[PDB]
């Protein structure tokens, strides 16, 4: 017996019970009337969503094993069941489980990412320093840090802020994000054999995960001729190394399409989900001011006027601690969450759900509990605060989800947050260009990601 749900019409499914525009608004509702495990049919696919703390929990860490596929997105074919992110494939539990590795170990023992992200400070206060005050579109300019930052770990590289490739790359991530989040590319994602062939923006999108690739597709050429075994120079070396070592062995576990993708996927994830965070901060605190003005005050006090942040700073730091996951609960960036798989048939509650079954743990639910965060539609810091201005855990932060699948890299990007939000405020007051009650905090669109507004700002130093 399967969930409830909505009775589904002939090739559309329930395509009518969905705003294309608002996804995540759409099963909100659908919760309400059926509750928190629900059965729809997006097209001819077969999906369950998980609406609620309760139940998107037990889905995330209850069936851990169960739930550890991922479902299929059309747009990122050029992806599937390679790398790590985009695999229903057996190939996903060790390359990820190396890659997680990898990634450790870089960012704990090598002095670490706070090396490497406080180094990329002093750069991104340099830009910033440029601006002169003058009114400036951060899209391309505070994404650096959290590009380069990604980069050097990936292929010890470093761009300066100038390079035509390099906003290139950026302004590809930024394309994609924004796309996948809009209405044409929902329906495409689920009526794909139908609209591929169709002009559309679903093309477009195609493109750049291509261009993308292919950037990436040199560049391990590029390490795999210089490769020394002995000395790996990175991310991208350790899985050459890896490659190389199973080459006689009959059944593969790593290709080169394989370290191409896999290099991708963490190219971007590592590049356009912090970066967008962290402009959406921006934005936010200039509709508060005085959320900045405390802010600013921790920071001058806690850390003067010149050191440059550092993690041990966060126990020390109340307010910016709280700041920095109101910030990334607030704005649901990737709400509907990503796609997950069932396994094998299996059993949730009382219902059944078939192998191939879709299943949406959806976040956005979980991250405005009511009850757990009151006034979940408000920026409000003391979300995270207790009533004697200690920091205050929540089981219910999970931006970055639970469980078999969670977000690959959780730790750099909530160490860069900080750190480069710490920074930013250490050294510049924000500046709106037009007036702070006036500024709209929602989404532009809705789909893949929650997508925040263009505006431009001006940042004035402080020395
Ligand atoms: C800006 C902060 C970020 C947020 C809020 C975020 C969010 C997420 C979410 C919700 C998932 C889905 C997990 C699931 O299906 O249950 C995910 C997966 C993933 N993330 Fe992130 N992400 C962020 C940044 C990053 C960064 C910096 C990296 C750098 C390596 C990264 C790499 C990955 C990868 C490879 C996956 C695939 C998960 C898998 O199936 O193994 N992400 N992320
Ligand atoms: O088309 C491209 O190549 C760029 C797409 C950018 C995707 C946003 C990352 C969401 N995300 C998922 C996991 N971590 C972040």
Same mark, same amino acid.
């Given at each position: 017996k399967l969930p409830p749900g909505p009775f589904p019409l002939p090739i559309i499914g329930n395509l009518f019970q969905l705003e294309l525009k608002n996804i995540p608004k759409s099963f909100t509702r659908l919760a309400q009337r059926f509750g928190p495990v629900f059965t729809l049919y997006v097209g001819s696919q077969r999906?369950?969503?998980? /609406?609620?703390?309760?139940?998107? =929990?037990?889905?995330?860490?209850? +069936?851990?094993?169960e739930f550890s596929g991922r479902g299929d997105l059309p747009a990122f074919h050029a992806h599937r069941d390679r790398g790590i992110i985009f695999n229903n494939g057996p190939t996903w539990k060790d390359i990820r489980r190396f890659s997680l590795t990898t990634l450790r170990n870089y960012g704990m023992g090598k002095q670490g990412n706070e090396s490497r992200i406080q180094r990329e400070a002093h750069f991104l206060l340099e830009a910033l320093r440029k601006t002169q005050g003058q009114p400036f579109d951060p899209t391309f300019l505070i994404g650096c840090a959290p590009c380069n930052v990604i980069a050097?770990?990936?292929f010890r590289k470093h761009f300066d802020y100038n390079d035509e490739?390099?906003?290139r790359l950026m302004y590809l991530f930024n394309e994609n994000? /924004?796309?996948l989040s809009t209405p044409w590319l929902q329906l495409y994602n689920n009526f794909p054999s139908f609209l591929h062939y169709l002009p559309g923006s679903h093309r477009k999108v195609i493109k750049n995960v291509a261009e993308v690739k292919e950037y990436v !597709?040199?560049?391990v050429k590029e390490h795999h001729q210089s490769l020394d075994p002995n000395c790996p120079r990175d991310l991208t070396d350790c899985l050459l190394v890896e490659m190389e070592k199973? =080459? /006689?062995?009959?059944?593969?576990? +790593?290709?080169?399409?394989?370290?191409?993708?896999?290099?991708?996927?963490?190219?971007?994830?590592?590049?356009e989900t912090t970066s967008t965070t962290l402009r959406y901060g921006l934005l936010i605190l200039m509709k508060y001011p005085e959320i900045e003005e405390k802010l600013h005050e921790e920071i001058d006090r806690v850390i003067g006027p010149s050191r440059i942040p550092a993690i041990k700073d966060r126990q020390e730091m109340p307010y910016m601690d709280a700041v920095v996951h109101e910030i990334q609960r607030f704005i649901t960036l990737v709400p509907s969450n990503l796609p997950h798989e069932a396994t094998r048939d299996t059993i949730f509650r009382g219902y059944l759900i078939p192998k191939g079954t879709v299943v949406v743990p959806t976040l956005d639910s979980v991250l405005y509990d009511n009850q757990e965060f009151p006034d979940p539609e408000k920026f409000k810091p003391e979300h995270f605060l207790n009533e004697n201005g200690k920091f205050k855990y929540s089981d219910y932060? =999970?931006?970055? !989800?639970?469980? =078999?699948?969670?977000?690959?890299?959780?730790?750099?990007?909530?160490?860069?947050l900080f750190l480069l939000l710490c920074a930013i405020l250490q050294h510049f007051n924000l500046k709106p260009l037009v007036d702070p009650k006036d500024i709209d905090l929602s989404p532009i669109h809705i789909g893949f990601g929650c997508i925040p507004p263009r505006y431009k700002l001006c940042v004035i130093p402080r020395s």
């Open positions: 999906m369950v969503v998980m /609406h609620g703390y309760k139940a998107v =929990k037990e889905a995330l860490l209850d +069936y851990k094993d050097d770990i990936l490739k390099f906003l994000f /924004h796309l !597709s040199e560049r199973e =080459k /006689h062995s009959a059944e593969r576990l +790593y290709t080169m399409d394989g370290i191409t993708v896999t290099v991708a996927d963490l190219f971007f994830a590592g590049t932060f =999970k931006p970055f !989800s639970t469980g =078999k699948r969670v977000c690959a890299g959780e730790g750099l990007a909530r160490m860069e």
